[PDB]
Ligand binder design. Structure first.
Ligand code: NAD
Ligand code: NAD
Ligand code: NAD
Ligand code: NAD
Ligand code: NOC
Ligand code: NOC
Ligand code: NOC
Ligand code: NOC
Lengths: 430, 430, 430, 430
């Protein structure tokens, strides 16, 4: 009596498959995993439930896992991020996926629920992005915890949740922090938003970036990438921060660092990257230049007070999907993107596949680790070993034609390290 | 018995009007022209036939001219550049427009033909982009030349044509070189492609730019913008040039300058910006890395040997409109964008409106000049006066909140110039 | 009874010669001129008097001219720009040079006077930088005008003077505008200040640039280079301009454009690049942050009101040559570089030799042109032919290993140009 | 019978004091330490022996420590890095300093030896940069170990030594890794070399960077800064790496990553930043373009085979101090800077004072920590607490006019952190 899947239109599978074919060729890390483990099926027995934006990239990840032997059931971790042609290709391949662009909140929860129970038994593995699946199980289905061998978590906000849970005796299953592998945080969060933040603002508004003042709240890995992207197109970028170290980094890169109370009067474009609530408020909106564009790229839509706009604007015109233009009592207009949900995935296609290969190779490794070597992972939050982190990167060098240097035995002795690595201490920040 | 217009779908007018509303707010130069001339209608009597990409930006230009009193009939200057919602809004406003995205070559010519004769008499003005309308009249409808008071030309290739015509006694009507106003060539050609080249490559392929080698043929104003855009996202950019000066400029900016025969073996992304034929040939395609992306942003599709691919590939798969992926005898794949037609307009939406306001304010000024002061323009090719060029720029400063400095009389005397300009000699290169 | 030369210390000639040896290897344009004309001595008969910063680069120029057969007598065009080891090497080689770092104003004039009369007759050629020699002859020695075949002028300010003179019937000798050859203005003025402005600020103060707000007055070729240099090291750069076009260029590159009245309160570093008087006044100094650094890189020291500081500060401490630190009545301190004279040459060594090879190859060509083909140059101000401008650039490509592309005859026909150039119309701005 | 100090010329003290006055104003972190601890003298009782480049910056550090109550004796950690005017000002202030620019190796060791015994008893604290003092005590004066309460270490190479020592039971005293405080490694190593690498190459050679190919070995924090500096001036930068992660970072920033065996044939400028031996060998020198410039910025001069040049060149000409130009059997020339010793300090003045304030505030904190709270530091290698790391940064925000944001209690609860920090987990990489 249960649907085998639920997508917007199965008819999009052909276009989706073409999409995955091109993407596969941009994802050597995932392709190399299949080449190494399709034969031995290290994930045989795993029943992986995934909750992570259902995009072309995620479809290649899903099929990599299946190729490695696991059974997979998936849901998106955002109501506007699914790419329907990718979801259809997956559904068609007979993998249970419950996801479509533009879900309601009740449907969003429903979709995650359809992934918990497989044909032959509940999930024994979690692949999360944001902690929603992780929190659902720990709060509504704890009984399933003993049957779950591990959790791998994709993003900063989900990772922070995990540490809050572990600090409070709640975390009941071993978890690998994938966000913090170097090859994820210093590539996906940085270089990925550097390209997909602009993509989302452009597809949504077609606005010229050059000449504009842009305000980026937060200067973490995401803000660093966003600020760099905007400045490369000629915007004057202003940064807001709560952390004196990130603030000093931004100042030393030539950015004016000040508060939102002050910057709201100057910005033409606003991007929130903090992962924190109450960044852009009604008091900020009333000070904004006419047609200021306001978006969020942080995991959850908690940074901008969109409720305030809906309750206080005198007009609200939908320009196209995910693009709303309000008119306030002061007569001025505000362009709001994706109703405040992460703009790169809501208004465009997320990070390009090559960088997502770095993130997802980390994810496959984490799944294998937890599944294949549970004795190595006590309940808590862990990091993939540096040696695996380095392997992720090495798997992407050939595609770029990078010729890496090999330490001579003489050099390796002088440096006190192995010719095959790890080449850095564990506290290295890269 | 003649159609009053011809567009893809009049039903798109509402969405288009919303598009124009947002764009108008990004185009102060055009809005300020209307504010200054709607009352006096300096273009009353003008019957302007336009041949220029039928986009949201062009629609604001078309309505600015109408507001200034002229009668206008328009066609696109490329078979893939029209934005159907913009064309519909114009058609709906009752302006005769003949344009849609994806015309055949015969239709392309047909559309230009429908603009030559107005309700009350042939065209008395030309607004061209590429020279196609200009060449059609001079070669098939010379009889209409005495009735045409002037020509204003938008782009480098069209301007070059005009000088070839003038050098050969063919040019029969006064022409203003709009491409070479400073506020056009050093803004539209540069900053505009800096943002819309990436937009087109992204919407077409979603490819990661970071980590790639990109080859840009030509280092003129368009190549300069394209190279800068690609390098800002982390691509290693190689430049090809025939001009020792542009080549030295590129080298001094840190770019490797070499030949296409050599670079075709390294590039992952190829962009042609030369305005010249035979840039990328079959011999180059056979040396390319797998899934290399190849596009053109020069006016005409004469830079890449697309015919060679169609005749020599073993497979050709249409991924989506304007995106074709070939498979060659060597087993490797080539992604070709927009069949070789300018990629920013064929795969995306062209330059953003703000920079297009600079170009189109120049165009309106040129029309007024020629129409309103023909005694000032003998047959030949001219430049708008520097004072008007500076006025275009000044009209866009307020939107950006630029506080310009005013020379004191003391300073103006020392510099030997007027406090209100021109502030530069005519040979100034900016 | 006349000195054969006058320098700080002939004993520095050996170190200077070593300097010139290294420089020669960085100046292929000048070396290639010698290789082509030492045999035929096209300048035989020329008695060239030069007034241009007596640096290592200028010494290679002086010897290139001598090698080409002319007789040369030189003076510096600034009291603080001479490089004593270079002046000594020249003096030693037996060329009459009157120059040393740190001349008084009376001495500065005296030195120029010692170059007017040669062993065998007055000067028959002028090589000027700033117009000082040009103005001295036209105002105190007009009688020598009929004997002077030509003038070649190095910089923007001198070129502007020439046009003021020509517009007023004063210019009595043919002059070639060397500043405006493309290979000079778009390389020396831009890329040269991009490297030597920082060099001067650093050798003078050792100040960290990152984190600072820097204010650059003017956004011409010099301001463009200076702004780019400062921003590359992490300074937040604010620009002041009087020209709406340059102001819009700066805004579209992400720079805040405002007035000095406003920026004087924010800057930590101030650089004037306008070529205009009254840029930084006492009213600006009283608003400055403590230890703000203030310098000028424009030709003459007329941009900053240094007299105001000397008359109004409560203290003035010389830190080292060309570096003065004042203390104002408000208790705050101002660091002034080179007493307001061009900072790159006053506090460092000017532009590096490679870019100076572009400028000086232009200068040698101009001398040959005027001297060798006077029938081609009526009284007035002219530009070197584009073909020579392109040759300057081509002569520097090999050193950089640039592989330039050659047009096929097919391509050259399509473009309507010669395979050997000129490749651009005369109004091209590059 | 022992000298009270030993410097090049005490007569330079006045100029040095002026230098320190300017520097103090650029070092708020150190000034704020004095303002907070001069009253309470937390270092009273400490007898700190320092071995760290004797520069203007280090002089402000030395006086900050004295102000905090310690007795200090200093030596430089490099034979060419001392700034004689700074050493003289210190000597004059009556602090025992043994250092001068250009020491022989025997003298270098002698100077360190003069710092071990104070008027009233051996050293009870070490402030090291490179590990030389640390290794001298552990190997020749172990008997003094029980009397030493702590070690604070400045740089990557010294920190690596410490971990090698701790891993081998040799480390006998508690050590704080100062290099790895975030405010040191991500500011001094990066932004500092970004400005002082160019300074050293420029003061030494005056070479144009634009147009050159530069090869940077290593892409750690130092290579990242060096590569960014060179590319900002127009050099094409090639990177060599042994670490797949750093290699992928460099590729994604647009740099070609290859081997030295390959790059030695292309580079015009070579900079080694690896901290490893055998980077540039005789086989590399024989392939180099004429007048290639070769330097090292890593701690010890072990990266370049300078011995090979001295033994194999046919000529060796000293251009000026720290600049040697060789001529090889193949007729080509090699410019070697500072005989291979760190170029920023050997040929220029090291990092500017502002960034050095970040490093030295960390150093003062470490000294206070170890001295004042030894119960908190067991034998081993430790990190300063994140809260102190953040305080270093906050102490430099005011000088830059940074307006930092304060978390509301609501926000701090949502983020699960204190309004006053730490704002990041311990594994954060910034
Ligand atoms: N959309 C995407 O593709 C994508 C990719 C990576 C991560 N993410 C998400 O982006 C957000 C941030 O990630 P990250 O890796 O940059 O986290 P980060 O910790 O590195 O960064 C964010 C910063 O925000 C600052 N900040 C917190 N509250 C603030 C406030 N009120 N005002 C100003 N600054 C404040 C913090 O000091 C911090 O430096 C998270 O929600 C994360 O899950 C999105
Ligand atoms: N798509 C757009 O939005 C847009 C905007 C502006 C202009 N254009 C078009 O872009 C093209 C170029 O414009 P531009 O303003 O840059 O012209 P430009 O003259 O400034 O530039 C092009 C350069 O190409 C070089 N070049 C010519 N043949 C070459 C060859 N075989 N190999 C390598 N280099 C070669 C030339 O030396 C030249 O510097 C024209 O067709 C123009 O009309 C497109
Ligand atoms: N020191 C050097 O090595 C070197 C090299 C090249 C030229 N120069 C000298 O540098 C100066 C400028 O050269 P350029 O080639 O950049 O000239 P440019 O004409 O290209 O530039 C200067 C600009 O200053 C602007 N400006 C004028 N008055 C102004 C005012 N009051 N406030 C703000 N902006 C103002 C103008 O609009 C102009 O764009 C001249 O004196 C020139 O001779 C020095
Ligand atoms: N001169 C200065 O002012 C200053 C300031 C900071 C540190 N330092 C010194 O600079 C050097 C490096 O510091 P860091 O903080 O960058 O270290 P880092 O560890 O961050 O960096 C160096 C890198 O070199 C790479 N590498 C090692 N051997 C290599 C080889 N054979 N070929 C290519 N790459 C190789 C490593 O993988 C590594 O990423 C150390 O000696 C350090 O003490 C100098
Ligand atoms: N194309 C994509 N497919 C899947 N996940 C993506 C894509 N782009 C960005 N993401 C993820 C979205 C994030 C925030 O939830 C991550 O941290 C990031 O990995
Ligand atoms: N959005 C746009 N609308 C109209 N014309 C455009 C747009 N973007 C670029 N162009 C034009 C296309 C060009 C080449 O034909 C021009 O030179 C340029 O002005
Ligand atoms: N090293 C140098 N030698 C000679 N002239 C120089 C040097 N650096 C800059 N200049 C010149 C100084 C200028 C301003 O007078 C020029 O325009 C510029 O060519
Ligand atoms: N001006 C300076 N004074 C003292 N130490 C410096 C200076 N510049 C760089 N350094 C140090 C030299 C280094 C390498 O030994 C450090 O890691 C760095 O902190």
């Amino acid at each position: 009596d249960k649907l085998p899947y639920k997508v917007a239109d199965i008819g999009l599978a052909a276009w989706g498959r073409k999409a995955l074919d091109i993407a596969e060729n941009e994802m050597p890390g995932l392709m190399r995993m299949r080449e190494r483990y399709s034969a031995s099926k290290p994930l045989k027995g795993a029943r992986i439930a995934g909750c992570l934006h259902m995009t072309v990239e995620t479809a290649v990840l899903i099929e990599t896992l299946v190729t490695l032997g696991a059974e997979v059931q998936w849901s998106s971790c955002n109501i506007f991020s699914t790419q329907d042609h990718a979801a259809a290709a997956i559904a068609k391949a007979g993998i249970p996926v419950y996801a479509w662009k533009g879900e309601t909140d009740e449907e969003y929860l429903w979709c995650i629920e359809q992934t918990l129970y497989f044909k032959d038994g509940p999930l024994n593995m979690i692949l999360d992005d944001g902690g929603d699946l992780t929190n659902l199980i720990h709060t509504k289905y704890p009984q399933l915890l003993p049957g779950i061998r591990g959790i791998s978590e994709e993003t900063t906000t989900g990772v922070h949740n995990l540490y809050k849970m572990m600090a409070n005796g709640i975390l009941k299953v071993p978890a690998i922090n994938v966000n913090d592998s170097v090859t994820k945080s210093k590539f996906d969060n940085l270089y990925g938003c550097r390209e997909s933040l602009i993509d989302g603002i452009k597809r949504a508004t077609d606005v010229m970036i050059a000449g504009k003042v842009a305000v980026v709240a937060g200067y973490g890995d995401v803000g660093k990438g966003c600020a760099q992207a905007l400045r490369g197109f000629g915007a004057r970028v202003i940064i807001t921060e709560i952390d004196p170290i990130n603030a000093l980094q931004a100042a030393m890169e030539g950015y004016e660092v000040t508060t939102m109370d002050e910057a709201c009067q100057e910005g033409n474009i606003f991007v929130t990257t903090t992962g924190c609530i109450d960044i852009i408020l009604g008091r900020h909106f009333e000070q904004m230049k006419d047609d200021a564009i306001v978006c969020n790229i942080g995991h959850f839509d908690v940074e901008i007070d969109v409720k305030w706009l809906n309750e206080n604007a005198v007009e609200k015109v939908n320009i196209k999907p995910q693009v709303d233009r309000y008119r306030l009592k002061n007569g001025r207009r505000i362009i709001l993107l994706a109703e405040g949900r992460l703009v790169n995935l809501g208004c465009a296609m997320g990070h390009p596949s090559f960088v997502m290969s770095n993130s997802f190779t980390n994810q496959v490794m984490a799944q294998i680790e937890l599944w294949t070597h549970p004795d190595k992972y006590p309940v808590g939050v862990h990091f993939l070993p540096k040696k695996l982190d380095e392997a992720v990167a090495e798997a992407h060098l050939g595609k770029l034609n990078v010729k890496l240097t090999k330490l001579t035995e003489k050099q390796a002795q002088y440096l006190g390290m192995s010719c095959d690595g790890p080449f850095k201490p564990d506290h290295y920040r890269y």
